[PDB]
Design an enzyme around this catalytic site. Structure first.
Site, PDB file in Angstrom:
ATOM      1  N   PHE A  32       0.844  -1.180   0.000  1.00 56.44           N
ATOM      2  CA  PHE A  32       0.000   0.000   0.000  1.00 56.44           C
ATOM      3  C   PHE A  32       0.883   1.234   0.000  1.00 56.44           C
ATOM      4  O   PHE A  32       1.674   1.433   0.913  1.00 56.44           O
ATOM      5  CB  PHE A  32      -0.946  -0.012   1.197  1.00 56.44           C
ATOM      6  CG  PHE A  32      -2.027  -1.018   1.075  1.00 56.44           C
ATOM      7  CD1 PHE A  32      -1.757  -2.363   1.247  1.00 56.44           C
ATOM      8  CD2 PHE A  32      -3.323  -0.627   0.760  1.00 56.44           C
ATOM      9  CE1 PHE A  32      -2.754  -3.310   1.123  1.00 56.44           C
ATOM     10  CE2 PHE A  32      -4.337  -1.574   0.632  1.00 56.44           C
ATOM     11  CZ  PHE A  32      -4.052  -2.918   0.807  1.00 56.44           C
ATOM     12  N   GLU A  50      -1.818  -4.526  13.683  1.00 59.85           N
ATOM     13  CA  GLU A  50      -0.857  -5.464  14.243  1.00 59.85           C
ATOM     14  C   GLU A  50      -1.410  -6.136  15.508  1.00 59.85           C
ATOM     15  O   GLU A  50      -1.203  -7.331  15.714  1.00 59.85           O
ATOM     16  CB  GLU A  50       0.467  -4.754  14.524  1.00 59.85           C
ATOM     17  CG  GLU A  50       1.555  -5.630  15.143  1.00 59.85           C
ATOM     18  CD  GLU A  50       2.876  -4.873  15.199  1.00 59.85           C
ATOM     19  OE1 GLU A  50       3.142  -4.153  16.197  1.00 59.85           O
ATOM     20  OE2 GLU A  50       3.618  -4.960  14.205  1.00 59.85           O
TER      21      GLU A  50
HETATM   22  O1  LIG Z   1       0.230   7.248   4.979  1.00 60.20           O
HETATM   23  C1  LIG Z   1       0.448   6.045   4.851  1.00 60.20           C
HETATM   24  C2  LIG Z   1       0.471   5.193   5.945  1.00 60.20           C
HETATM   25  C3  LIG Z   1       0.850   3.867   5.773  1.00 60.20           C
HETATM   26  N1  LIG Z   1       0.954   3.340   4.515  1.00 60.20           N
HETATM   27  C4  LIG Z   1       1.207   1.891   4.349  1.00 60.20           C
HETATM   28  O2  LIG Z   1       0.969   1.254   5.590  1.00 60.20           O
HETATM   29  C5  LIG Z   1       2.171   0.689   6.088  1.00 60.20           C
HETATM   30  C6  LIG Z   1       2.289   0.868   7.594  1.00 60.20           C
HETATM   31  O3  LIG Z   1       2.728   2.185   7.804  1.00 60.20           O
HETATM   32  P1  LIG Z   1       4.162   2.457   8.478  1.00 60.20           P
HETATM   33  O4  LIG Z   1       5.186   1.897   7.572  1.00 60.20           O
HETATM   34  O5  LIG Z   1       4.397   3.889   8.750  1.00 60.20           O
HETATM   35  O6  LIG Z   1       4.128   1.592   9.837  1.00 60.20           O
HETATM   36  P2  LIG Z   1       5.436   1.395  10.761  1.00 60.20           P
HETATM   37  O7  LIG Z   1       6.380   0.448  10.122  1.00 60.20           O
HETATM   38  O8  LIG Z   1       6.101   2.710  10.937  1.00 60.20           O
HETATM   39  O9  LIG Z   1       5.016   0.852  12.073  1.00 60.20           O
HETATM   40  C7  LIG Z   1       3.275   1.435   5.357  1.00 60.20           C
HETATM   41  O10 LIG Z   1       4.460   0.710   5.236  1.00 60.20           O
HETATM   42  C8  LIG Z   1       2.666   1.625   4.005  1.00 60.20           C
HETATM   43  O11 LIG Z   1       2.818   0.431   3.243  1.00 60.20           O
HETATM   44  C9  LIG Z   1       0.923   4.198   3.425  1.00 60.20           C
HETATM   45  O12 LIG Z   1       1.123   3.801   2.292  1.00 60.20           O
HETATM   46  N2  LIG Z   1       0.674   5.541   3.599  1.00 60.20           N
END
Ligand SMILES: O=c1ccn([C@@H]2O[C@H](COP(=O)(O)OP(=O)(O)O)[C@@H](O)[C@H]2O)c(=O)[nH]1
Ligand SMILES: O=c1ccn([C@@H]2O[C@H](COP(=O)(O)OP(=O)(O)O)[C@@H](O)[C@H]2O)c(=O)[nH]1
Ligand SMILES: c1ccc(-c2nsc(N3CCNCC3)n2)cc1
Ligand SMILES: c1ccc(-c2nsc(N3CCNCC3)n2)cc1
Lengths: 288, 282
Positions: B58, B240
């Site tokens: 995404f 999660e």
């Molecule tokens: O504004 C956003 C927020 C999240 N995501 C998707 O949702 C995942 C989870 O977000 P994030 O990577 O910030 O989670 P984290 O690894 O920081 O916990 C991202 O990797 C993206 O693939 C995105 O495309 N746009």
């Protein structure tokens, strides 16, 4: 039944697995194709019991008690009642040329016994090898309707400790107790290239024992049919494999990798081999 | 499947390669670490079934910027030699980079709405994956792999991961006791897990399995999120937290080690990690 999807478990309280502190550090617990190798200390039977009971799993157990081997049935069945799949549905299938000689054994609830009258071959080698044809035939005649998994063993054995649903999987073999620590060059595979059971010196994962294998009915049907067909080809070519059905079983499992492998806890001879520290339990052992 | 003749080193029953880590769960699912698998054998098995792997990502709003590196590195490291279908969900189809793909690999761009809260973007992945399992995936791929985009491949990620249902050890918690796992702890939430339960803390950024099992997981998580929302509660770690509740009750058939989900900036490169395969991008 064999459920199509993952089962949903209730709340359970048990010790947390420890990622950085493995219990078994002395043995290989997974094959290179990522099938577990089942040793004591690798499984929580409570979790596995829940998973399989939620599917109302029925296990078939086949034994051939031909000619004088009917004498082994009483101890085999009485010990199976104490140790084999207790709590689950069990269906014993005793193939014999002497139905009247099958002993009376009282069974626990949800467990039953069928006597399958079959012909006795003259040579013990043929009795042993024709098990494959007979198992395959009965998969079609009875087993596909009656049980979810089939466990196929020798009758001159007794259960000494737990043998349970930790063994169940689409296709399993068992490490032969005489070779679990051996190099593949010492494996007593069929080495004659003219045989369907042929395995070259540079091939082989394990030496599996012919006395304990199993799986889903569909996979057992396919294995036993393949081995029987390979034996018939060998026969037409005037060849008999060095260790008979076991040689063909080894060729099959070399080319179709099992989804679990059982440790020698599940197939042992205590008189011959004693009780090495690597074996925390002796579960299923030869009868002198 | 029936394998051809192969020559490779004999497995050694009494001389295990990994003595430093748990390589099988208590329900007999392998935990995938370097040294536990022979990729030649597994490649044969999966090629013989003409396996197609779908990979979902995404890339919403500014996260479209991560796609070029994600896809270029996937081309070097992800399921090379197998059929791959990339599914890029984005609010900006025109911002998807032109990336040259190897043979047998294809990419589909799916337009989706952008939510304002990053939490909502992350959580609604569950609904969208579940919906697309029915609309496309079930008829197009054999397995689905569902990951975060803000990542790059640095080493082999192949068919060793494929199984009906897998989760991945979160790299911040693989050495932690269950009491320290950041599960949802409020009984009011559908994601609730008590202090005396839990096997592992799985990362929301890498899960997968057969299309049918992934459809079931993502549907269940979405439904549980909708219940929470009706009850005025949001799980502490969103999708999660729900993934962890799901995999507690429905045990995965493989568990990936943190080699498969790492952040070298935050965690370095410890001895227990022989390879760093898929890592966060700063
Ligand atoms: O504004 C956003 C927020 C999240 N995501 C998707 O949702 C995942 C989870 O977000 P994030 O990577 O910030 O989670 P984290 O690894 O920081 O916990 C991202 O990797 C993206 O693939 C995105 O495309 N746009
Ligand atoms: O006359 C015979 C020969 C063998 N068998 C069956 O074939 C199996 C394999 O034979 P055996 O146990 O003697 O092989 P071994 O373990 O000695 O190699 C036996 O356990 C029986 O189940 C039998 O029923 N009657
Ligand atoms: C070397 C050779 C054979 C064995 C051996 N253990 S059990 C077994 N059987 C075959 C006869 N039926 C009962 C099962 N055989 C062990 C070491
Ligand atoms: C402590 C906390 C988080 C991590 C961590 N590793 S990868 C990762 N993500 C989430 C953001 N998108 C990329 C994947 N997070 C490591 C240690």
């Amino acid at each position: 039944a064999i459920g199509e999807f993952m089962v949903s478990l209730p709340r359970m309280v048990y010790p947390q697995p420890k990622v950085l502190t493995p219990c078994r550090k002395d043995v290989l617990v997974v094959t290179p194709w990522l099938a577990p190798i089942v040793w004591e200390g690798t499984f929580n039977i409570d979790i596995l019991n829940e998973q399989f009971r939620l599917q109302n799993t029925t296990i078939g157990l086949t034994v051939f008690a031909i000619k004088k081997y009917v004498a082994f049935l009483k101890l085999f069945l009485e010990t199976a009642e104490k140790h084999f799949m207790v709590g689950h549905r069990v269906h014993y299938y005793v193939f014999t040329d002497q139905p009247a000689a099958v002993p009376r054994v009282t069974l626990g609830t949800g467990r039953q016994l069928s006597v399958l009258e079959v012909r006795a071959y003259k040579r013990w080698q043929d009795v042993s090898m024709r098990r494959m044809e007979m198992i395959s035939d009965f998969c079609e005649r009875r087993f596909l309707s009656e049980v979810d998994y089939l466990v196929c063993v020798d009758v001159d054995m007794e259960f000494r400790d737990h043998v349970g649903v930790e063994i169940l999987t689409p296709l399993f073999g068992t490490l032969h107790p005489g070779f679990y620590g051996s190099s593949r060059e010492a494996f007593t595979y069929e080495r004659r290239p003219q045989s369907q059971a042929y395995i070259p010196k540079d091939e082989g994962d394990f030496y599996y024992g012919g006395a304990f294998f199993g799986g889903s009915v569909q996979e057992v049907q396919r294995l036993t049919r393949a081995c029987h067909q390979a034996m018939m080809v060998d026969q037409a070519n005037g060849i008999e494999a060095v260790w008979h059905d076991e040689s063909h079983l080894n060729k099959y499992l070399l080319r179709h990798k099992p989804t679990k492998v059982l440790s020698p806890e599940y197939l042992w001879d205590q008189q011959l081999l004693g009780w090495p520290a690597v074996l925390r339990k002796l579960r299923f052992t030869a009868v002198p």
